[PDB]
Amino acid sequence: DNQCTVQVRLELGHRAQLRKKPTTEGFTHDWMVFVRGPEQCDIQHFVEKVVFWLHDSFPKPRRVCKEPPYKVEESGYAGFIMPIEVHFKNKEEPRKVCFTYDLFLNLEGNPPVNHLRCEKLTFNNPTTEFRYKLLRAGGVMVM
Numbered sequence: 397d398n399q400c401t402v403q404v405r406l407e408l409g410h411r412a413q414l415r416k417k418p419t420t421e422g423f424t425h426d427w428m429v430f431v432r433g434p435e436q437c438d439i440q441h442f443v444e445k446v447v448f449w450l451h452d453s454f455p456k457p458r459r460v461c462k463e464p465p466y467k468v469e470e471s472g473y474a475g476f477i478m479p480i481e482v483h484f485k486n487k488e489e490p491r492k493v494c495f496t497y498d499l500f501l502n503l504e505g506n507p508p509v510n511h512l513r514c515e516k517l518t519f520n521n522p523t524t525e526f527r528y529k530l531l532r533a534g535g536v537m538v539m
């Protein structure tokens with residue numbers, strides 16, 4: 397009657413590769429980290445912003461995307477653990493969700509890295525408003 401659950405999917409992922417020639421700063425690797433929906437799902441309907449926390453060696457290490465694409469592209473020396481906050485267009489709780497993203501590079505002369513990590517979010521009894529956003533994004537009713 398009143399109750400519903402809505403699930404949506406996020407994909408966090410990254411690519412990393414060894415540069416053929418280090419940058420003049422001597423950066424050895426290009427990487428790119430992202431949050432996206434699965435194809436035919438528009439997470440922008442319910443995602444306010446994504447906040448990527450780079451290693452504090454990076455200038456302005458707190459990177460915000462308020463619209464898609466939610467990604468950071470960098471060169472650097474090493475991998476690190478990257479906190480990632482996904483903020484929702486929700487007037488209620490919860491307003492966001494945090495992830496500990498493992499941003500690892502290809503050590504030695506390993507082939508380049510191409511990782512994906514699939515996260516299912518479950519929203520219980522969302523407001524009709526926020527519910528409209530979740531379902532618009534390709535969210536699904538369950539329970």
Ligand SMILES: O=C(NCc1cccc(Cl)c1)c1ccc2c(c1)ncn2CCN1CCCC1
Pocket residue numbers: 451453454455471472473474475476
């Ligand atoms: O690539 C990195 N930063 C790029 C950059 C840009 C501009 C200036 C400077 Cl100085 C650096 C970077 C990445 C990771 C790092 C790091 C720097 N220093 C320690 N770490 C963790 C190393 N630990 C990882 C697990 C064990 C060691």
